[PDB]
């Protein structure tokens, strides 16, 4: 069982083991304090060992969404909020300044605790910090971090989606429109996030969901299949051809390609009005 | 402003234009109804046009997080919840069954609306559906989808994290341990989410955060820098060497590598006790 400290925007969960002065361990990229529990066992007759799940990880829980801007690479919201969490935790557990150790990005949180809340620090240890900002070659290291994130979060998708368009023989006009970069960096961040979400949570689950031809035949009088005139040869049209061949449900051709409703709204509307008006 | 329907677990936002029978447009991968607004203008004399932001997209908001199982590639949670959202929207706006058009994955949502809530459907259109489940060659298309997601999400991350370890000259013992798949399937999916979160929301923001050398000198007496004995040559140790070079703050060597506190807890503790006990 873990302890809870309720703070602005999160329930902060932590392990607490031992007796003595408070010693707070701040984890790095794993984000959870359980990685310190073997160490806590070694220290528990000397310190009250406090091993934190930082608020975005483990058994901690946000009570309010992150700011939209947190995905921006120069946001400082999260590191400042993590540092304030440690300061409030220290104050909640001790009337004296406490001992603090962070490792990896947890040591960067520790630096911000010292910077913004020196009053809670008795002694502090930075174990293998990967901060580059004050290095004489900061640019070199910053750009490497930026580029490897960009590779995983945006470039893998870009290359895979081009192949996927070929698999499905998507028309070039649709591929260009579906991949057209937004005109702001924030808009582009959001575009890539949305595609990464659709990849993980939508494409497989929806395209192999439990629909049978029998589901259509029960209500065939209500159904129209639509094929774009500018997306001939693409996989979705083959799906409609199969439905039609097996069920007789009609195919209506409609202007534009996969994105025809915004490519050719007037012609698209004219067909819908013919169908249903 | 966008209209709102409050549903279980989400606030569903949608555009509403026109008068006449309700016509609901369900978007595909872009997820948002704004892509139908030029079309809605052509139809607004004949239909009440309703263009939905599906609940995971746009101005719609989840009021509780996605279930953990939504990550499963055969999960039906999201597609069924999207179809129920459309049915509830129809019922909230119309006493009569309504007209519905979906495109791409939005046409799959439309198929589930017809299957599970046929009572809300007057007429329905499936614009370029990419569902494969009932096709004779379903397996070919399913496997292509499974492969492109694995390539972008799993292979992209694995290769990128190996490059990150090389860039920082992480010691082999550390690389192995930090890349070890969890011992429980619950904790493997969580490891993916946690790594992607750290990649997007932590590494760049924290490693280029606002710490200066002068921040260390102000309270230098409080600080210990810690370098692992088994992680020599790695970038985080170079950060500590630079801090030491500029500030005189001592470096203390401690057993293990980057993860030395769990690799060698006894020896790690012995050094902390020498420091602070
Ligand atoms: C329908 O709306 N679908 N699916 C479909 O047609 O069949 C499955 C759909 C699927 C995927 C997308 N978007 C997409 O491919 C764009 C991703 C690229 C983002 C921008 C990257 C720029 C360079 C590249 C490539 C749309 C529709
Ligand atoms: C500190 O704890 N760091 N930072 C550091 O050393 O320098 C910035 C840190 C950084 C990175 C990790 N890596 C890690 O968590 C491994 C992730 C591997 C991929 C996850 C597998 C998911 C499924 C697939 C593919 C640790 C520590
Ligand atoms: Mg790019
Ligand atoms: Mg001793």
Swiss-Prot record, chains A, B:
Its EC number is 3.-.-.-. Residues 58-77 are annotated as: Disordered. Keywords: Hydrolase. Residues 21-138 form the AB hydrolase-1 domain. It is an enzyme of class 3 (hydrolase). GO terms for cellular component: membrane. One of its GO terms (molecular function) is hydrolase activity. Belongs to the AB hydrolase superfamily. This is Uncharacterized hydrolase SAUSA300_2518.
């Amino acid at each position: 069982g873990m302890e809870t400290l309720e703070l602005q925007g999160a329930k902060l969960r932590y392990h607490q083991v031992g007796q003595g002065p408070v010693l707070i361990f701040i984890p790095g990229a794993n984000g959870t304090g359980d990685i310190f529990l073997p160490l806590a066992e070694q220290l528990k007759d000397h310190f009250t060992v406090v091993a934190v799940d930082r608020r975005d990880y483990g058994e901690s829980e946000l009570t309010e969404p992150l700011p939209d801007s947190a995905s921006n690479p120069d946001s400082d919201y999260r590191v400042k909020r993590d540092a304030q969490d440690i300061a409030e935790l220290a104050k909640s557990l001790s009337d004296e300044p406490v001992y603090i150790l962070g490792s990896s990005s947890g040591s960067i949180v520790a630096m911000h605790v010292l910077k913004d809340y020196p009053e809670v620090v008795k002694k502090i240890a930075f174990h293998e910090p990967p901060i580059n900002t004050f290095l004489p070659d900061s640019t070199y290291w910053k750009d490497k971090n930026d580029d490897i994130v960009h590779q995983i979060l945006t470039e893998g998708l870009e290359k895979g989606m081009k192949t996927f368009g070929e698999t499905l023989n998507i028309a070039p006009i649709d591929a260009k429109m579906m991949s057209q970069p937004a005109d702001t960096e924030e808009g582009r961040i959001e575009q890539y996030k949305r595609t990464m979400f659709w990849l993980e949570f939508e494409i497989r689950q929806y395209t192999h969901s439990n629909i049978t031809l029998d589901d259509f035949t029960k209500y065939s009088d209500k159904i129209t299949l639509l094929n774009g005139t500018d997306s001939r040869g693409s996989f979705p049209q083959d799906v409609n051809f199969y439905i039609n061949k097996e069920t007789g449900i009609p195919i209506v051709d409609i202007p534009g390609g996969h994105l025809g409703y915004i490519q050719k709204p007037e012609g698209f509307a004219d067909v819908l009005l013919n169908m249903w008006g």
